A paper describes a structure:
The DPBA–ENDO-WT complex structure was determined at 1.88 Å resolution in space group P41. Indeed, DPBA binds the first ion through the carboxylic group and the enolizable α-ketone and the second ion through both the α- and γ-ketones. The γ-ketone is flipped by about 180° and forms hydrogen bonds to two water molecules that mediate interaction with Ser46 and Glu50. The phenyl group of DPBA makes no direct interactions with the residues in the active site. The obvious difference between the two ligands lies in the fact that DPBA (1) makes no direct interaction with the enzyme, while L-742,001 (2) does interact through its chloro­benzyl group. ENDO accommodates DPBA (1) and L-742,001 (2); however, the binding mode is only driven and is predominately mediated by metal chelation.
The synthesis of mRNA in arenaviruses is a process that is primed by capped nucleotides that are ‘stolen’ from the cellular mRNA by the endonuclease domain in cooperation with other domains of the L protein. The L protein cleaves and snatches the native cellular mRNA cap structure through its endonuclease domain after ∼11 nucleotides, and uses it as a primer sequence for the RdRp domain of the L protein to synthesize the viral mRNA.
Numbering used by the authors:
A (entry chain A): 0 to 182
B (entry chain B): 0 to 193
The structure:
């Protein structure tokens, strides 16, 4: 556990590119001491790498601060009340067009298509609200089939995931030592 | 000394506020291994906390990327060629007025007043160059007498500085040991290529 956490921190500091948009989540990760919290912030760190790559590939701004669509519009001088709470992975306002980006990773075709339709529906549900406010929605769903990203060599991506999986294994191995113990 | 470095890192992670403007320098600091580089980046981290604190209390933008005044103007579409190279600690363009901020810490009254005059002159020397380009300079010099800032509790600021000083003492001993080493003689002798 201590060794796994140490190896994870070393990968984070030495083998994830120092793009400044990642620095906050790296610090969030490096600050964690509890295994369950290392795992949680490590998955989030991997996710941000994917999100920022998707934003750069899709031509918009990564939603670094988890702003809502409401805030993004207000931020740009656009009133649109009653908009449900939607926090996109990326966004870009060009003229009257609001690009909204959702991205994800899934590892089987069934889970891929399910999440693809979920994120599509999530953005689609504010199209008409945006249209009433003069904003044409440009919704983008970028589904990935693995965790490959431009900020990490493939071998270090793999080692990071292998190490996170060991923390998962220990948790699950922990409670089967709970389940054959208990009541 | 490994323990001192570890303590500085814990203070950085646990007691320096998670302001997004500090992310880069905090990460730069946490990645250092060599005692002297830990010391330099730790001092730079503390300086960054004060500079950003000053920008916030003076109502302007911290100069996150060390942009020059010329660069700040060309980003807002203002031409102005001349300009000496000047990197303010903070800036804000409002209407036709360019706020420029310099901040510093000094620990004696004589050094405080000397530095205040220096920074005041540094900014004043471009007032007319800006006025020709249509810009009213609003120059601010924020001189501080201690290291307090809003991103660190007072006790942690004190203990961070205490541990940096102990790390200074340790790296001074590393240097003296190094100057007794063959590596040092080999560095001297590499004077085969002046
Ligand atoms: O990025 C997104 O679009 C999400 O849907 C949230 C997300 O990625 C996430 C990642 C890690 C933990 C919890 C949510
Ligand atoms: Cl639809
Ligand atoms: Cl100085
Ligand atoms: Mg998201
Ligand atoms: Mg400065
Ligand atoms: Mg200064
Ligand atoms: Na609605
Ligand atoms: Na238009």
């Amino acid at each position: 556990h201590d060794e796994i956490i140490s190896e994870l921190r070393e990968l984070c500091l030495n083998y994830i590119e120092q793009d400044e948009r990642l620095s906050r989540q790296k610090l969030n990760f490096l600050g964690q001491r509890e295994p369950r919290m290392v795992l949680i912030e490590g998955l989030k760190l991997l996710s941000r790498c994917i999100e920022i790559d998707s934003a750069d590939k899709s031509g918009c701004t990564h939603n670094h601060d988890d702003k809502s669509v409401e805030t993004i519009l207000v931020e740009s001088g656009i009133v649109c009340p009653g908009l449900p709470l939607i926090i996109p992975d990326g966004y870009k306002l060009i003229d009257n067009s609001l690009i909204l980006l959702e991205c994800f990773v899934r590892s089987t075709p069934a889970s891929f298509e399910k999440k693809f339709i979920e994120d599509t529906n999530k953005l689609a549900c504010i199209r008409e609200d945006l249209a009433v406010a003069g904003v044409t929605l440009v919704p983008i769903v970028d589904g990935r089939c693995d965790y490959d990203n431009s900020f990490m060599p493939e071998w270090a991506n793999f080692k990071f995931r292998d190490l996170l999986f060991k923390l998962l294994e220990y948790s699950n191995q922990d409670e089967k030592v709970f389940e054959e113990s208990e009541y």
